[PDB]
Design a protein around this ligand. Structure first.
Ligand SMILES: O=c1ccn([C@@H]2O[C@H](COP(=O)(O)OP(=O)(O)O)[C@@H](O)[C@H]2O)c(=O)[nH]1
Ligand SMILES: *[C@@H]1O[C@H](CO)[C@@H](O)[C@H](O)[C@H]1NC(C)=O
Ligand SMILES: *[C@@H]1O[C@H](CO)[C@@H](O)[C@H](O)[C@H]1NC(C)=O
Ligand SMILES: [Ca+2]
Ligand SMILES: [Cl-]
Lengths: 39, 355
């Protein structure tokens, strides 16, 4: 399963599907695993 | 000419046992069924195997305190689960469990012996134990721009949907069936294709999700704009499909007061066994082969269609409240703990989940 299909990334971040893993690339101003934190 | 469906509805109502409970006991059969594979007991060795295999996030409860391994693949989903566990932990006995926060279940039924993993969705071909999904509090899909921090807060969404339903009484709703979602299962394709062929019959369009790579992911058309669930309520007929597993869409559609068209009968959440075809919603064949006949039927039997929609709305309104979610967590974990055949000891390095 591509974990990005269920939109784990908040605040219009980009989701990258890695080997059975995901990464959220935040818009500037956001941080955290889900880009949920305001920097 | 509708006798066949009419008789099915009469039959289904004759079979129907309404839940009269004021608590989540409506669902106790689901707990009993999901724990049946573990009635011989869950050994320490079995738990070590689940943990070793990284099928989920390892939680422990001792002395009414919650502990967890460091790693959680989806922190917001762990946070949502923790919200409910912490609400009820003052009344929970000592236990430990592995809670899978991925979309897909982890324990196929042919695995012997069965090992215990909690997942939000399964089919009867899995031995995972269902739990109320994280999204009842937080961590559901972050659909930009409508749910920028993730679909959650069921308590608030309930209020918004009931208010929207009041703005769209049945007789004012639009007769074109409606769906807005992404291509998380190809089982959705026939509806989008029917919509493109017959847009007065069905308005079904693919949005994009965060895994989008090309126009293939929307069947060769520009992605549709995302539409808030409260803006679904103006439509009489709302479709629901599986995605990777079951979808969070389903519960919301009932509260519109609209008639839910539920496609397939394999992928479940814990509350689905209490929603009954023809009592609470219209069942649609997995392949959509009877969808046009069903849409003609409801249009020609609008009184019956409204009765079904009202029953489904009332069931979610009365038996899927936030308190039902908390209740189910408490009853599920209390019953599960009875099958641990050993005494749990907190693991070295597991921090406490506060507060
Ligand atoms: O335009 C949209 C698209 C999606 N969603 C909601 O976002 C979640 C994810 O929907 P999607 O179809 O992308 O995937 P699913 O989880 O249904 O497989 C579901 O609760 C949908 O109801 C929504 O409210 N409006
Ligand atoms: C839950 O409701 C059932 C009746 O539906 C009742 O028998 C039971 O005692 C109730 N439990 C609690 C704890 O209120
Ligand atoms: C009902 O909704 C459909 C699909 O969105 C739209 O094409 C149609 O014009 C609407 N009909 C009325 C009478 O509003
Ligand atoms: Ca992935
Ligand atoms: Cl996933």
């Amino acid at each position: 399963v591509n974990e990005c299909v269920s939109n784990p990334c908040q605040n219009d971040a980009t989701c990258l599907d890695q080997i059975g893993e995901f990464q959220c690339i935040c818009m500037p101003g956001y941080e955290g695993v889900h880009c949920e934190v305001n920097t | 000419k509708w006798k066949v469906f009419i008789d099915q509805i009469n039959r289904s109502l004759e079979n129907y046992e309404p839940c009269s409970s004021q608590n989540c006991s409506c669902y106790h059969g689901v707990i009993e069924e999901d724990l049946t594979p573990f009635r011989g007991g869950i050994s320490r060795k079995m738990m070590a195997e689940v943990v070793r295999r990284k099928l989920g996030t390892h939680y422990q409860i001792t002395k009414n305190r919650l502990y967890r391994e460091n790693d959680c693949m989806f922190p917001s989903r762990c946070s949502g689960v923790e919200h409910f566990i912490l609400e009820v932990i003052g009344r929970l006995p000592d236990m430990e469990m592995v809670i899978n926060v991925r979309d897909y279940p982890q324990v196929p039924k042919w695995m012997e012996p069965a090992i215990p993993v909690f997942s939000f969705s399964k089919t009867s071909e899995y031995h995972d134990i269902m739990y109320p999904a994280w999204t009842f509090w937080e961590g559901g899909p972050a659909v930009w721009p409508i749910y920028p921090t993730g679909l959650g807060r069921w308590d608030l969404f309930r209020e918004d949907l009931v208010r929207s339903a009041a703005q769209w009484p049945w007789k004012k709703k639009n007769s074109t069936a409606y769906f807005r979602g992404s291509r998380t299962s190809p089982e959705r394709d026939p509806l989008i294709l029917l919509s493109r062929k017959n847009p007065k019959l069905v308005d079904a369009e693919y949005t994009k999700n965060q895994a989008w790579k090309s126009m293939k992911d929307t069947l060769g058309k520009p992605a549709a704009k995302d539409v808030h669930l409260v803006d679904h309520c103006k439509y009489k007929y709302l479709f629901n499909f599986r995605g990777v597993a079951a979808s969070f869409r389903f519960k919301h559609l009932f509260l519109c007061g609209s008639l839910v068209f539920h496609v397939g009968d394999e992928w479940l959440e814990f509350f689905y066994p209490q929603l009954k075809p023809w009592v609470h919603y219209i069942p649609v064949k997995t392949d959509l082969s009877n969808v046009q006949e069903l849409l003609q039927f409801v249009k020609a039997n609008d009184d019956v269609a409204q009765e079904i929609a009202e029953r489904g709305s009332q069931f979610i309104r009365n038996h899927l409240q936030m308190d039902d979610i908390t209740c189910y967590w408490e009853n599920l974990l209390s019953e599960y703990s009875k099958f641990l055949s050993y005494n749990v000891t907190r693991r070295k390095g597991y921090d406490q989940i506060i507060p």
